[PDB]
């Protein structure tokens, strides 16, 4: 068999079945859809069995880095010393174009809470701190209420699910910072400091929050793990190509008729995703210009690549981009493609933490140059200068925010160079 075509996920194979909040999000409704079912049996299997299901499912981090979750969660499966261990759920979701983690929190809070317990059990963690951006004040409150219902029901807290395992789930609100979504910068924010990433090593599995073994995992990665244990790793691994398994939450925004969050199979064609769910590109497929396929951090691709690209980690890598958060942004032919990307570099210049030189000075530099390419106020040689600057930033910074400031620039220079050189021509003839 090995279905070589993907998509058309059936409503019975969807995990986040309350994505649209048309069913009750509280505990009573959640249990009616499968949540908190046989959780005691899962916990009594143990961490080795749980980590077995995560590995077999081929689940990969949904936070944008896309690492193998099963291998990542296994660094915490080591004998303890004097320190406690923690699970940090990353609910920051600051990436432009991304809004999937918001839905999970306010429409399926109990899936996240059960993921924390199951995931925390696998890693030997004594508690889970859920870090949710400060702007999501109503979504955090919903989660805080669901946390109360779980406490009162014996599902978490002392003797969680009756399994003799003690677990805590804390909610901590951010205070406004896209950089706190970075795993180490999140930890420093929980500890009460500025959200500035740490250098690695040490790795959070060895030295994390409060100086203790920690694993930082995305909201979506945690939220699906209990289902993978109930339904098995093999079921999850039955979707998508090889090394690209599972369902995936997609946001489709920008210039589509029906912007929407939606669940769909991994490795579905990008066109099929946009057309069937989002209602097509505004003004028809032939009005398409370029798509940012995974939030601002990833390079944009043109209409030619968009014809036959699949939405998975490896298919987009060979397109010179990345799946990222899978936040598809569509830009139609009326968009000022230079001005769209200039506003992204302005976003990064506003988010850089300032800690390390290449991004503190470089991204601010690329912002000034892009501001001029929008007006055409430059000469063509500055395009290759901007390319070189972006390479001096990439791979030289402390964290990946620097890399994600460069890739938008490299995408624009890679595919729309004539657009840049064309706009420089007009400014010259007008002023000379």
């Amino acid at each position: 068999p090995k279905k070589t075509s993907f998509g058309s996920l059936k409503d019975e194979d969807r995990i986040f079945t309350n994505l649209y909040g048309r069913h009750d999000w509280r505990l009573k409704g959640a249990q009616s859809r499968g949540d908190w079912y046989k959780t005691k049996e899962i916990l009594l299997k143990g961490p080795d069995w749980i980590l077995g299901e995560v590995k077999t499912s081929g689940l990969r981090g949904r936070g944008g880095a896309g690492f193998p979750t099963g291998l990542k969660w296994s660094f915490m499966n080591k004998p303890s010393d004097g320190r406690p261990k923690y699970l940090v759920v990353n609910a920051d979701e600051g990436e432009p174009g991304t809004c999937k983690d918001r839905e999970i929190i306010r429409h399926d809070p109990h899936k996240l809470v059960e993921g924390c317990l199951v995931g925390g059990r696998a890693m030997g963690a004594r508690a889970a701190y859920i870090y949710i951006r400060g702007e999501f004040y109503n979504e955090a409150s919903n989660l805080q209420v669901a946390i109360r219902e779980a406490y009162e029901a014996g599902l978490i807290g002392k003797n969680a699910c009756g399994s003799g395992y003690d677990f805590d789930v804390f909610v901590v609100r951010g205070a406004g910072a896209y950089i706190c979504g970075e795993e180490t910068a999140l930890i420093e924010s929980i500890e009460g400091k500025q959200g500035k990433p740490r250098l690695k090593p040490p790795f959070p599995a060895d030295v994390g929050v409060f100086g203790c073994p920690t694993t930082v995992a995305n909201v979506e990665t945690v939220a699906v793990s209990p289902t993978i244990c109930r339904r098995g790793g093999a079921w999850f691994a039955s979707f998508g190509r090889e090394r690209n398994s599972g369902t995936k939450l997609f946001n489709i925004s920008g210039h589509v008729n029906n912007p929407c969050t939606v669940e769909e199979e991994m490795s579905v064609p990008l066109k099929e995703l946009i057309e069937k769910h989002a209602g097509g590109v505004t003004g028809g497929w032939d009005n398409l210009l370029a798509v940012i396929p995974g939030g601002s951090s990833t390079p944009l691709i043109p209409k030619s690549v968009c014809e036959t690209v699949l939405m998975d980690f490896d298919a987009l890598i060979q397109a010179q981009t990345g799946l990222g958060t899978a936040a598809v942004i569509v830009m139609d032919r009326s968009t000022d493609i230079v001005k769209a990307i200039a506003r992204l570099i302005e976003f990064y210049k506003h988010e850089s933490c300032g800690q390390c030189t290449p991004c503190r000075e470089g991204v601010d530099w690329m912002n000034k140059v892009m501001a001029r390419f929008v007006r055409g106020d430059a000469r063509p040689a500055e395009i290759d200068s901007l390319w070189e600057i972006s390479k001096q930033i990439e791979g030289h910074t402390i964290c990946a925010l620097g890399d994600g400031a460069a890739w938008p620039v490299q995408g624009l220079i890679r595919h729309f160079r004539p657009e840049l050189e064309e706009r420089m021509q007009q400014f010259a003839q007008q002023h000379q």
Binding site: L199, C353, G354, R360, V363, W365, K368, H396
Partner: protein, 263 residues
């Protein structure tokens, strides 16, 4: 039996566990360029000037922070190492003010000297530069903070050596500033020592302001008599006049600090 073997430019050197890539290079006499790293402060790893290539690894590592692993071959002069330094120096100098003639650091400036040895010889920055407010932290240390390179040495020293948590960073991104936020004087018996660790003219000696240049001073190694510690000092003279007092390193006595009364 615990020492592991690593290579610097192919040359074997036996180091103990926990030694960083920067410290293993010192053992073969190679000094890696640095700004934020200071051997008596906590590692920071933010300036990025110590980036070095490791053979068979696609990504440069920070030499001041990275622990060295067994069998690594540190390429301190490869093209990737040299392009890393060139790029980092370009970012440091992009917003730095053209102050060298009026800046007291001139002639003994690590930003100047490492730009000559590891940086490019020209600029491709065509924008307008950043400018920063000047702070008032007391009558001993003059601040010209547009020259600051955000190495955070002064913050770390004040916290860890001086035991004063009054220096920090306010703001974010490019306009991240070093200071006290409020109008506070960094009055401390050891406060003058932030003039020396500061690798640029951002912090300079207010009493010393404008009087001399480093190349014209004669260095006399002597001792301090303001107290009984006997800190080792250097007396800087120029044409028969005493110009300033500097620390002289002595591990067993004052390390590389002196008190404000000695200075």
């Amino acid at each position: 039996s615990n020492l592991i073997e690593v290579f610097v430019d192919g040359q074997s050197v036996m180091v103990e566990p926990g030694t960083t890539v920067l410290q293993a290079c010192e053992k073969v006499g190679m000094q890696i360029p640095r700004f934020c790293y200071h051997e008596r402060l906590s590692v920071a790893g933010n300036c990025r000037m110590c980036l070095v290539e490791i053979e068979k690894a696609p990504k440069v590592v920070a030499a001041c922070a990275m622990p060295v692993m067994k069998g690594w071959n540190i390429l301190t002069n490869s093209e990737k190492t040299k392009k890393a330094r060139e790029g980092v120096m370009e970012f440091l100098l992009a917003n730095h003010p053209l102050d060298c003639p009026i800046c007291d650091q001139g002639g003994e400036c690590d930003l100047q000297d490492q730009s000559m040895m590891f940086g490019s010889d020209r600029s491709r920055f065509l924008e307008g530069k950043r400018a920063v407010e000047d702070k008032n932290i007391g009558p001993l240390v003059k601040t010209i903070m547009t020259r600051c390179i955000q190495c955070t040495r002064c913050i770390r020293f004040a916290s860890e050596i001086a035991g004063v948590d009054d220096l920090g960073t306010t703001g974010r991104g490019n306009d991240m500033q070093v200071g006290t936020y409020i109008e506070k004087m960094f009055m401390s018996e050891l406060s003058g020592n932030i003039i020396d660790i500061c690798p640029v003219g951002a912090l300079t000696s207010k009493p010393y302001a404008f009087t001399a240049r480093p190349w014209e001073t004669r260095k006399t190694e002597s001792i301090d008599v303001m107290d009984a510690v006997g800190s080792n000092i250097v007396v800087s003279t120029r044409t028969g006049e005493v110009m300033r007092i500097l620390p002289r390193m002595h591990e067993d006595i004052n390390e590389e600090w002196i008190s404000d009364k000695t200075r």
